[PDB]
Homo-oligomer: A and B are copies of this chain.
Amino acid sequence: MCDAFVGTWKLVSSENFDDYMKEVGVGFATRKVAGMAKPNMIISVNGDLVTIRSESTFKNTEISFKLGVEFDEITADDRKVKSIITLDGGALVQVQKWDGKSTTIKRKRDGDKLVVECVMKGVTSTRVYERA
């Protein structure tokens, strides 16, 4: 089931991502650089360890994690958060928490695409990736 996600994925469309970063509290200059980037997302599994890398001109990131186990993460916009990632309706669902706030990032397969739905306080961004 994790293998539905394993691979290299290139970004293909992006909707409401600006509004979403705005709720998150990302600054103006960062919001415009991040918005132009068009990153790859790479997913791998080594045993019970999952790795998501994201790569672009803006920033290279990587989280390594076990499903269902809280871990510390520094996001690309520099929030220090607690994340838990679960497999949930066949989707990887990540909840990020910091300073009383939370955001949910859902990665789900739909046809040959990987759809990423980030939500915070009503504002939903959608980003679609295809295989490389």
> Interface on A for B, CB 8 Å cutoff?
44, 46-47, 49, 51, 53, 55, 60-62, 64, 66, 72-74, 78, 80
Q: With A80-B46, A80-B47 in contact, do A72 and B64 touch (Cβ < 8 Å)?
A: yes
B46 touches A53 (CB 8 A): no
Q: With A49-B80, A80-B47 in contact, do A64 and B74 touch (Cβ < 8 Å)?
A: yes
Best-surrounded residue of A49, A53, A64, A80 (most CB of chain B within 10 A):
A64
The chain B residue sitting closest to A51, CB to CB, is: B74
Residues of B within 8 Å of A61, CB to CB, are 62
For this chain, the copies found in one complex come to 2
Since A46-B78, A64-B74 are in contact, a sample of 12 more A-B pairs with Cβ atoms closer than 8 Å, ordered by chain A residue number, is A44-B74, A46-B74, A46-B80, A47-B80, A49-B72, A49-B74, A49-B80, A51-B74, A55-B60, A60-B60, A62-B62, A64-B72
Chain A, interface SS category: strand
What CA separation (Å) do A78 and B51 show in the bound complex?
A: 12
Residues of B within 8 Å of A44, CB to CB, are 74
Chain B nearest CB, measured from A29 CB (Å): 19
The chain B residue sitting closest to A48, CB to CB, is: B72
Residues of B within 8 Å of A46, CB to CB, are 74, 78, 80
What CA separation (Å) do A78 and B46 show in the bound complex?
A: 8
